[PDB]
Structure formats: C-alpha cells, structure tokens
Amino acid sequence: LQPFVNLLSKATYWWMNTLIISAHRKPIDLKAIGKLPIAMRAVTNYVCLKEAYEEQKKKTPSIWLAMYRAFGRPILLSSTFRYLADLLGFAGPLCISGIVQRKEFLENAHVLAVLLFLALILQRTFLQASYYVTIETGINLRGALLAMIYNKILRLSTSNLSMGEMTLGQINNLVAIETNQLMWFLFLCPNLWAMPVQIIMGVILLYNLLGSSALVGAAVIVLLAPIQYFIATKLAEAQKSTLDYSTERLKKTNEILKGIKLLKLYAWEHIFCKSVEETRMKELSSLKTFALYTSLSIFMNAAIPIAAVLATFVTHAYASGNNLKPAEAFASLSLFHILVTPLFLLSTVVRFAVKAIISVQKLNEFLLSDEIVAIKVTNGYFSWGSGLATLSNIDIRIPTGQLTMIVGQVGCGKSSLLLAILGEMQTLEGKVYWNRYSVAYAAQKPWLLNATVEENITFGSSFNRQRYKAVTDACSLQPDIDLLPFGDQTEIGERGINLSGGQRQRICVARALYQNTNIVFLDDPFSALDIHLSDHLMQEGILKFLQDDKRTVVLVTHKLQYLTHADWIIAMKDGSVLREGTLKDIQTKDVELYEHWKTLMNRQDQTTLERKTLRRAMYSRRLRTKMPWKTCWWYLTSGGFFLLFLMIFSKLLKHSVIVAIDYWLATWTSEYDQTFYVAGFSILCGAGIFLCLVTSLTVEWMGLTAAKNLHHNLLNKIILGPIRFFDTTPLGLILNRFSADTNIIDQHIPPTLESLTRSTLLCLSAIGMISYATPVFLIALAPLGVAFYFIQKYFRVASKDLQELDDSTQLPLLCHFSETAEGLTTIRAFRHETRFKQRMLELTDTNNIAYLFLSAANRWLEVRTDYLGACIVLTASIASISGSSNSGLVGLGLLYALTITNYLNWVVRNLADLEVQMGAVKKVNSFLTMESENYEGTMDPSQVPEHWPQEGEIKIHDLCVRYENNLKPVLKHVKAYIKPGQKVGICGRTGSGKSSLSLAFFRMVDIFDGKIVIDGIDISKLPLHTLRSRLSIILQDPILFSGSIRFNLDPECKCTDDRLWEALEIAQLKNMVKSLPGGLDATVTEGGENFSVGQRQLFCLARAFVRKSSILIMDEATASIDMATENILQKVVMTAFADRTVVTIAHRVHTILTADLVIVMKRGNILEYDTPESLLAQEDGVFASFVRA
Ligand SMILES: CCOc1cc(CC(=O)N[C@@H](CC(C)C)c2ccccc2N2CCCCC2)ccc1C(=O)O
Ligand SMILES: Nc1ncnc2c1ncn2[C@@H]1O[C@H](COP(=O)(O)OP(=O)(O)OP(=O)(O)O)[C@@H](O)[C@H]1O
Ligand SMILES: Nc1ncnc2c1ncn2[C@@H]1O[C@H](COP(=O)(O)OP(=O)(O)OP(=O)(O)O)[C@@H](O)[C@H]1O
Ligand SMILES: [Mg+2]
Ligand SMILES: [Mg+2]
C-alpha cells in the first residue's frame, strides 16, 4: 500500500508541507533546502545534452533535436497529464447541464454532484502534476544549457578578431535572457498543444449544447486571440521605448550620485535634477502609451467574453422556436468562462515560442564560434587567426629553473609570444615542447575575481600563512592591504573595493608567486610600479623567493634594468627574435644591441599618492509575515483620493453589473415575447463593457500618477540630502533605489494590484451570490474560510522567503559567468579549468534548486486551494439540489461555485506578489524621508550684498569641525585671519584636516565650535546655496559629466559665450577646444575620460574663472598632474587669479613656498601661521622638515 500513499504525496506535494510550515520558525536557508536529487543534478543533464548534441553532430547541428532527444519523455508525460486534465475539466459544464435539468441513475442529480466533485479534483490534480513535470524538465534544460555554454566559454579563444568588445555583452545576454526565455518556452510548451485542442473541444461542446447559434459567440471569442497578440506586440514596442528612456535616466542618475559632493560644492545639483526630471518626463510620456496598451488588453480580455455572451444569447433568442432553457444557457456560460483563459493566453504562448526560436538561433550562432630546458620551440610560426603570422621564426628556448627575460619594443609581440607558448593562438607551423604542467601567469592586463583578497592570493591553493605573509611582504602589499576596511577578506574587483592599476597588478603578481608551480610567467608586472616598489619586488620577490623554490621564471619587461640579474635574455623585433642569450652572449655576438640598451638606459610618488586616496575612502568606516498595509495605503493615496475613489467605485460598479447580467440571464431562463428580456440583457452588456473600459483606464491612470509622484519626490529628497548620507550609504543601494524599485513601482504594481482587486471582487461576488441562492452555504463556507486564511498566511511567508533566496542565489551565477568570461587566458594558464567548472556546477545547482522549490511551493498552494474549491463546489451543488429554489438560481450558484476555483488561488498569489512589491514601495518611501540640510538663511538675501564675496576678507574664530555629531572634533580652536588679496598655503602631515578646513569654509562639515567670517558675515548666518554659488573650488580630481563643453563651463547658462571663450583662453584651454570639432559645443563623455587629466584640471580652472567667485580654493590640485601641466597651473594661479584670494592645500610644499603666507596643520591644530620664509628662518619646525625633504 505504501506506493499508493507515496504517489498521493507526490501529487499533493506532501513533502512541501514540512518546509512550508517551518517557514515561520526559520527563514528558508539553502541548507534547510535538501540538495538536488542525483537524477536532477545539472551535471547529469549536461551529460545527456552533450551526448545528444554530439549524436546530432555525427550526421549544422541543431539544438532543438538535442533537447528533444534529452527531455522528450517528461514532455510527453506532461502532455498526457494536460490533455487528461482538460478533458476532465470539460466535465464542469456538462455536470452543470445535467444537475440543472434535474438504470441510468446519472440523472438522479445527486450522484452527478459527487461525480462533478471527483472529476474536478482529478482534473486539477492532473493539471498541477503536468505543471510540475514541465517545470522540472524546463529547469533541467536551463541547467544543461548553462553548463554547455560555460564549457564553450572555457574553450573560447581570445583573438581580437573573434572576441570583440561585444563578446562579453553577448555572453551576459545569453546567460541572463536567452537561456531564461528558452526555459520559459519549455515551461509553456505543453500549452502550445493543450490550448488549441481545448478551444476546439469547447467550440464543439458549445455547438452541441446551444446549436448553430453559438457560432456567433465562438467567432467573437476566437477574435480575442489576434487582438491580444496585436496589443501585446504594441506593448512590447512601448516597453522597449520605455527601457531606452529608463537606461538613459539611470545613466544620468548614476553619474549624478557619483561625485555628488562635487555638485554640492558647485551648487549645480538643481540643474542636474532638472535635467533628470526632463528625462523622467519623457520616460513617463512613453510609459503612458505602455499603460494605454496594457489597459486596452485588460479591457479586451474582460469585455470580449461579455460581447460573445450577448451575441450568443440574442441570436439564440431570435433564432429558436424553443425558448432559452436554463441548463443550456448556464452550461454555455461556464464554457465561455472556461475558454476565455486559453484564448487569452495562446497569444502569449506564441510570443514565447517566437522568442525561443530567436534565442535558440542566437545560442547556436554563439556555440558555432571560434575556439583554441623548461620549454623549447623550433621553427615556430603563430598568428591570431588573421592568416598572417604575427610571430615568425620562433626559435625560443626556456632554460629550466632559471630567470629568463624578454626585451623588445612597444607592440613587439612579447605578450603574443607568451600567449603562443601557452598555446592560446593558432600555430601555423612549428612545435613547442614541455620538459603540459600548469604555469603561473600574470596577464599584462591585471584580472581579479569578486571574492576577497585572500581568495585572489590563494586562487584555490591551500592556505599557508607562511607563504601568504612572505609573498605579501615581497610585493610590499601589506600596507595597502591594511588600508582596506577589513584588510583581507575584503571584496575587490568590479563589485568590491575599487583598486588602482598598480595595486591590481601587485595583487596579480602576488597570486602568481604564491601559486605552487614550476613555471611562472610575469608579463610586465611593473606596468604602473614605482622605482622603489619594483626594486623591492625584484630583489626580494622575483629572485630570492623563487631562488629558494628553484622555479623557472620567464619575465617580460620594457624596463631594461635588472637585466644583470637575469640568467637568460631574449631579444625580439617585429614579431621575431633578433637574438637570445645572456648579457655576455649578446655582448659578444651583438655589440651594437648590447650598447643600445645602455644607450637607452643611460638616456633615462604615485604609490604614496595611491594609498592616500585609498585611506581617504576608509575614513568613514520578529514577525516577518505581516504585509505593510500602511505602506500600501500610502501608495494608493499617493495618486490622489479622487483617483482612488474613482477606481474603487468603478470596479465595484463593474462587478455589480456583471453579476446583474448573470442574474438577469437566470431570471430570463426562469420561464418554461422575449423582447423585454433581450433588450434588458443588451443594455446590461453595454453598461458592463463601458464600466470595464472605465475601470481599466482608471487603474492605469492611478498607477502612472503614483509612479510620477513617488519618483519625483524621491529624487528631490535624495538630492537635497546631506553629504553624510552618500558618505555612509554605498552608492549601489542608492542607485538601486531608482534602478529596480522605481521599475517595480512603474510596471509591476499597477497590473498586480488590478489583478488582485479583480480576483478579490470576483471571489466575494461569487460567494455572496451562491449564498443568495443557497443561504445554508455559509455554514460549510466558514471552515473553508479558516483553511483559506491559514493557507494564505503560510504560502505568503514561504513564497517571500523562497523568492528572496532565489534572487540572492542567482546573482553570484551571473557574477561568475561574467568573471570567467574574462581572464580566460589566466585560467587556462593556471589550468584551473576543472575548479571553475565545478564552481559553476555548484552555483547553477543552487540556483536551480531554489527556483524549483519556489515553483513547487506555488504548486502546493494551487493544489490546496483547489481542494478547497472542490469542497466549495460539492457543498454548493448538494445544498442547491437539496434546497428548494428556482432553477435559474441553481444554475447561477453552480456556475459561480465552479468558477470560484479559478480565482481562489490567484487572489492569494497576487496578494503575495503585491506584498513583495510593497516591500520595495516601503524601501522607497522610507528612503525619501531622510532629513535635509538647513538651506534656510537667517539673514535676508537682500541684506547680504549681491557682490558679497568681492572684498575677499576671511576670518576664523576658534573654529572646530566635526564630520558627524558625537565624534571627536577633527578641528579644534582653529583661528585664522586671511587678509584680502592674499595667497594662503596649507601643508602638514596627511590627515590633519586640511580638506576638512576647506569643507568648513563651504559649510559642508558641521562647525561645532567657533565660526568662519567672510566680509564680516558669518558663513552660518547665510543660505548655504548663496555661499556655494559665489565660491570657487578646485578638487584634487576634477570630474566632468557627460555633455557639451558649455554645459560643463556653466550649466546655469548665465554667462555669454564670450565669457566662456575668455575663460578657456586664460586657462590655456582655448586652443584645445578649438582644435576639437564643435568648439564650445563639442561633446564630453561622463567622468572627463574624453580629455586628459591636465585638461580636466584646466576645465576646472575655467569653471572657477567663469564663476567670478572672487575667492579660490585648491585641494592639492597638482596631485597626479604632469610637471609641465603643474607649471602651467602654477602660472595661471599666479597671474589669472592675481586679484583673487587663493587658499591652497599644498600636496608638496615647494609648489607653495612662494605663497604670501603659509599655515601648518597638525591634528587639527595650527602649529604655524606666518610667511613660509619666516618659519624656515625662525626655527626648524615641521614645515622646515617636510619642506626641506
Ligand atoms: C514560474 C511559472 O511556473 C508556472 C508555469 C506554468 C505552465 C503553464 O502552463 N502556464 C500557463 C497558465 C495556464 C493556466 C494556462 C500560461 C500560458 C501562457 C502564458 C502564461 C501562463 N501562465 C504563466 C504562469 C502562470 C500564470 C500564466 C503554470 C503555472 C506556473 C506557476 O508558477 O504558477
Ligand atoms: N589576443 C590578441 N588577439 C589578436 N591580436 C593580438 C592579440 N594580442 C596581441 N595582438 C596583436 O599582436 C601584435 C603584438 O601584440 P602583443 O600584445 O603580443 O605585443 P607586445 O610587444 O607584447 O605589446 P605590449 O606593448 O602591449 O606589451 C599587435 O598587432 C597586437 O595587436
Ligand atoms: N568622510 C569622513 N567622515 C568622517 N570623518 C572623516 C571623513 N573624512 C575624514 N574624516 C576625519 O578627518 C580627518 C582628516 O580629514 P581630512 O581628509 O579633511 O584631512 P587632511 O589632512 O586634509 O587629509 P588628506 O591627506 O586627505 O588631504 C581624518 O583623519 C578622519 O579622522
Ligand atoms: Mg602586450
Ligand atoms: Mg584631506
């Protein structure tokens, strides 16, 4: 008997109840979820799919055939279940038919009720079994496809001809969209055959029950599918347009957030906010058409059935000598309700099928793509697939266990030489011998995972504290490591703590040196290394650390230095080897080349600067079940009480009119001329259509209004927020507040809310109507209501947890595919292919199990609610037949009871989804409630002179500065009197609050004690906007936002182009802009990458000049600037700003030695404030010490 109960559980999902029930006590952890059965592990599915694919290739290969060969049987089983389920589900109307017309005891009207109950249960259990089988096969297919494309990625080539700039984009698209769409098509595949059969059977049954008259209604409903497909295509068009505008808006917002401090300093936040508001306006303009089409689709879906009913019944009434019977009428109405959904969804199935065909074509295109004495090579010719040997006559030899160096000119091919020796490119002729063992490789372009530093260093190697410390010290990486927030175990790479090129390549070199292997390749590890660091790495790392290990080291470096240490040297030229040998060998054979090295060698602070920027970033650092009804009400009200009332009233009236239509039909059928009834029915149907249209339009209007209001208010509040907000909160979350949350509010909330309200109203109306026909039904209803409440609670909590876990598991998979897509050369050099493949299998298995359990929970909820609906139908039917009432009311009760089962689960599912989305709404609403700054100014703007800062007098009175309240004041008792028309120099030990002093000048940081006085007006006693408007500033790293040169010079557009030209001339940038096309109107890319760093500084100086601040502040402007550019900067500061007041945060003292006066800072203390010449001649203080060095 055990098999019977086992199958029952596998059908009623009894295994899901323990996880779902426990969902309350503990969040659904990955461990809590049992691992995938070996029958469903991604590895096995990949094996089967590869077998099928190779069988196809044995006879150009097509994926579709392989997918069939792999997963046909589950699909056939699913189709069998689906066909049986639909065939049984056609029993509903037939049973209603026979019960209303109430040894062939089937007419007894009692046995038929239990027959209907059992048939409904069997139908729905089979249908859910089919859903689950197709879900499982689809997820298996997704796992197999991901594994297959991952293997392809691992075997991909790196030729620039093949792997273009868009190759990584294509791979991300495949993993994120194409595979998912193919999975969805696999989910929906059974429908593609179960829908047309269902529709045909429905039409045949309609003809049998109601005769040729029902043909009109059949045609009217069949017209639903083309309409749905057309409006769906238009909707997709509008959605693409909205996606384009949304991407533009997101780019603008992201650039704004990054460097927000700069915008606040320039006081330009308002103009950027206005531009983003314009972008949002266009986005909303497109979203309005999207909403129009969505509303049209909903209206058609909810009205075409009414039109079909109207046409059918009017035609039958006017074209039948026999008056309309009740049983036939209600059976036909139930059949229409059965057929509406399949027709409404066949169009979506077709769209998914087309998208899947496109996706499979794209995946096939991807797959059919190109792919690939320690060492000696003889007669080696290699190319990058161009057909022309990029390397020729490769007679290289790599002596075992000895340092080897490769020298050459720019773009000689040494990097290509290493790649070819790795076998990473086609070998036209010649062979390479290994005497393959894995080789430690540090790519010319450094590469890093998204794991922490420890993972990068180990890279899967067993941890050894001794080796880790030794290599870290050898590469001088310990300090910068300590600078990190968590030191080690600190995420780095694209998503983690951003690192400069020097640090990245140092980490890569550390990885290479740590990894235990006999062969090490270092491709110019000194790309951005200072002399001291490079020398330390060479002496301690390259030689000693590997001398002990007796490794074989091949080094590629432009810097001819250190060649003395190298045992063997290689000379290359134009993708060919001039000579190979030691220094003595080259000297003997090629004197000219030997001397040429000395000739070039004889004709010969970034690291410290880099760490300073890194250290600056480090300065800053029960019942999870109840939905947020407060937040949902806040959202609903956001649109406006008028719109909310209109929506509610319209929907209530629509459902009242629909139930009125049904009751009118019942009363009409009561009898057993018809003009009165038909006229009434027609007017009712017209009113219903009108109300459907009105309610759809109203819900969409409410959605649009709410989205616009919420987004606008959020952007205003965030932009008007204090700097600390962005300093603490990671930029990622703030950006996500507009990336996803806004997308959800725009697109998901309105449709989901409309569906939830419609389902709730339909369920309530059905219950009320069956009670009206069957007053005794409520007694049986109440326990069912209790069960419904419990199911609602459990499923809502479980689904929330499962969905969140699914997303958290998915994100690492995309991250890993993106990472492995890059650095393929590095992985293949380490030959860690197996490790990464296993990692991918683990990640995909976890994601698949999460998704599968989410779908299984959905199935469990469906089965429970469906047994509930079956009990409802049984009780309603039995009570009605037993109860004495008019036949029409009996038919109405049976019809509504049968229907209620379709919506009884949609109500709860939409409720859960709306809860999840209200989560995001709460996120946004809470985020926009953050307190703003004291923009109000105590003094009247008129009282403060318009040209207030012209004089340039500044005083400091015992100032104290604190970044945040309750923290130690970085500045204390800071007093300073800066004479107008004076130059002020500031220098001291790093971290002495110089930039803090500048921020205090700009009010950015709180002035807890003391004051800053300019022109006799306290800075605090003034609007911060006014202060920032008429003050200049030159940050250390200038940033320019995407747009024209005019926009950067003056977003306010207040000054004439003559002023801009004069500013660019004085800033020495007039010729630079003139040479570039477009002149003043030339475009600029985001972040100022279009121009050189010195040009960015010139742009900043031009901004200062045009601002006419009368003041000037420089925060180590010369830092990270070319010496000639630094001299130009000094000249322009000295001459152009002669009449202005200059305050400089001197990165280097000698640049500010000429300042009229200097200030010495130390731990928030003004140790010295005099002329720099006097301080040097007075005492040998701190200023004298660092300035002398
Ligand atoms: C994650 C998707 O897992 C499922 C997968 C399925 C498989 C399936 O034949 N769908 C039919 C719906 C049935 C009732 C007609 C369908 C067809 C076309 C468009 C959408 C849809 N449906 C898509 C989801 C359910 C609502 C409309 C069912 C149900 C689920 C589910 O999660 O409940
Ligand atoms: N992966 C690649 N695919 C295609 N062509 C490549 C690839 N790598 C290099 N090349 C081309 O091969 C030639 C030499 O490139 P390579 O990087 O090997 O030279 P190099 O002397 O090491 O240069 P570098 O100054 O960048 O260190 C150039 O034409 C370069 O464009
Ligand atoms: N964002 C911040 N939040 C809180 N405290 C900060 C922040 N930035 C700096 N501090 C504190 O202020 C001290 C000095 O700040 P600041 O960067 O202005 O000084 P500095 O001497 O000009 O430094 P730098 O070397 O960057 O020019 C830091 O040591 C830290 O104590
Ligand atoms: Mg190179
Ligand atoms: Mg500073």
Coordinates of C-alpha atoms and ligand atoms in Angstrom, one line a residue, residues 619 991 993-996, ligand 5:
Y619 CA 37.8 57.4 6.9
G991 CA 45.0 63.6 7.8
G993 CA 42.0 68.1 8.4
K994 CA 43.1 70.4 5.6
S995 CA 40.3 69.3 3.3
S996 CA 38.1 69.4 6.4
Ligands
MG5 MG 42.2 65.8 3.3

